[PDB]
Amino acid sequence: GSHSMRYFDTAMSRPGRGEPRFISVGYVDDTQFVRFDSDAASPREEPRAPWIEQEGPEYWDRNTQIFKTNTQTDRCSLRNLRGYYNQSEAGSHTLQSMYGCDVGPDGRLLRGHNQYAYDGKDYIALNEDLRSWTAADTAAQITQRKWEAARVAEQDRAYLEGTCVEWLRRYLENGKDTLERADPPKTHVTHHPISDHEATLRCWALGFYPAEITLTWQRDGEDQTQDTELVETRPAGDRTFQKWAAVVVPSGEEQRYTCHVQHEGLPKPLTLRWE
Amino acid sequence: AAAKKKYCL
Amino acid sequence: IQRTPKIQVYSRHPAENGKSNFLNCYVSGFHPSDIEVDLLKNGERIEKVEHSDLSFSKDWSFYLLYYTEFTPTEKDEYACRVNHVTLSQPKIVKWDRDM
C-alpha cells in the first residue's frame, strides 16, 4: 500500500551534566532501520534492520557526518530557544523534530513533513505546500523570519521531493520481504467472571504488522465505545504488535457481543464471539 | 546523502 | 508541561510455564523523556534488561520498550517498576498473563 519514511530526533539539554544529547532514529512505516546517538562511545549512523546493512561505506560515512553536524545544529537551536522564551540557564529543555515523506502504492509523493516541538508543544512546521511555515507563537515567528530570509523551505522541499522519496523507494525494494508484508492478527476471545452477575470479555489481536488496527466490541450490532477498555497498541519485540479490547457484560448475555477486527493482513475482517 | 541537513531554529 | 507514562507489562509470546519467552514493559505517552524502568522477578531487579532506542509518537510523547528473557512458572511473580518526574514514588505494575 502506501508507505512512510520518518526521522524522529530528540535533543535535550542537561545543565551541569555536559552538552545536550542528540539522538536520531529513522523508520520506514513501523520498522526502525537506523540510529545515531551523540552519547555513544563512537557516535555513528548505525544499522538497526537487516535490509539496510547492504548499504556501502559511503552511505554510513555521509549520514554520520550529517548527523554529527545536526547534533551541533540542535545545540544551537536549544540555545536560541532558551533565549526566545526568556528561560533560565538552570533548566533542562527538549527539542524534537519529525521529518520525511509519504508515498503511495506507486511510489509517488503523497506529502512531505518537517516539524518541530519545544518542551512537548508544537513550535513550527513546514506547510503541506513545502513553501511556507506555520509558527505556534511569537518565539516561533522569529524562527520563521530567519528561515524565510535564508530560503530554508526551498532546501527542505528539494530534500523531501527528491532525496527522501528516492531513498524510501530503495528501502522498500531492498526490504520488500518484510516492509511490504502485512502479517494478520491472530485473534481469540477470553472470558473471566468478575462476580455472580458480570463477566469480562476480552478480544485479543497478536502478532500483526503494521501496527495500525481496528478492534471494537458491539452489543446487538451497536458500537460500545464508552464501555470498552482499549489498551494502546504495543510492540512484541519481534517486529509485530499486540492489542486488546475488553467489555464487562451481564452474565448470560455473552452471545449478544461481537468483536470486530480490521487489519490489512486479513483476507477479510473478522467477527469473533466467545467460543 | 539520505539524512537531512538541519537548520538552526 | 508534563505527561505521565502509561505502563503495560506483558510477554512477547503467549505464556507457557517452563517455556522461554520475553518479558516486556512498554512505557508510552510520557514527557519529558527521562524515565527509569526496572523489571522485577519476585521483587528483585532483573539485571540484564535491554531497551529500545528513544522515539516518540506524532503527539510528541515518548515511548520505550524494556525487555528481557524469562521462563514463566506457576510460582514466580514478575512486575515492572517505573519512575518519572510526574510520579511521587515509583509505580509498580504486576505481570498478569491475561492482560
Author numbering:
A (entry chain A): 1 to 275
B (entry chain C): 1 to 9
C (entry chain B): 1 to 99
Passage from the reporting paper:
We determined the crystal structures and thermostability of a set of N-terminally extended peptides bound to HLA-B*0801, and monitored the trimming of these peptides by ERAP1 both in their free and MHC I–bound forms.
The structures show that the 8-amino acid AAKKKYCL core of all peptides, even the very long 20-mer, zigzags in the groove in an almost identical manner to the 10-mer. There was, however, a noticeable upward shift of the backbone from P1 to P3 for the 12-, 14-, and 20-mers relative to the 10-mer: Cα-atom shifts of ∼2.0 Å at P1 and ∼0.44 Å at P3. The electron density for all peptides was well-defined over the AAKKKYCL core and P−1 Ala. The structures also showed that all P1 Ala residues had undergone a rotation within the A pocket, as exemplified in Fig. 2B with the 12-mer. Furthermore, in all structures, because P1 Ala residues are less deeply anchored within the A pocket relative to the 10-mer, this created a large cavity that was filled by a water molecule. In the 12-, 14-, and 20-mer structures, Arg62 swings out and up from its canonical position, which opens the A pocket. Although the position of Arg62 in the longer peptides is different from that seen in the 10-mer, and small differences are seen between the 12-, 14-, and 20-mers, all orientations generated an open-ended groove. We then monitored the ability of ERAP1 to trim the MHC I–bound 20-mer (RA)6AAKKKYCL (t = 0).
